[PDB]
């Protein structure tokens, strides 16, 4: 949105963008992991199916934000994918 209507920001739009929205990612994703929390442990006999569900998303959401707000793609991408050539 910034790259178009506003200004280019070759890398200073991608940067300026998470400068204004690290809030909602680490606010939902935290809220999500805590809502899944009662299934992963806590309940341990009423339905062990709760364990099967929450274990494979608590695990993934740790590695879906502490990574995707960071280090590996979701910034790096737009750079080499959109820019770098055409």
């Amino acid at each position: 949105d910034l790259m178009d209507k506003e200004g280019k920001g070759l890398i200073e739009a991608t940067l300026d963008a998470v400068r204004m929205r690290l809030r909602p990612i680490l606010m939902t994703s935290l809220a999500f992991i805590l809502g899944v929390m009662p299934l992963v442990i806590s309940t341990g006999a009423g339905s062990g199916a709760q364990n099967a569900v929450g274990t494979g998303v608590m695990g993934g959401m740790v590695t879906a934000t502490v990574l995707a707000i960071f280090f590996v793609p979701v910034f790096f991408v737009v750079v080499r994918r959109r820019f770098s050539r055409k």
């Binding site: 890398i11 940067l15 998470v18 400068r19 960071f70 590996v72 910034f75 790096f76 080499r80």
Partner: protein, 38 residues
Amino acid sequence: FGWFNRMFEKSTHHYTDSVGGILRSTGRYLVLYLIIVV
């Protein structure tokens, strides 16, 4: 409270400067991405 003052620091320094710090490089965290896939 701290709380706000805290979050505002991380978000700014700490994070955003360390994002322009990694954005500077590229091929190290690309070879990391593929190491992740393996």
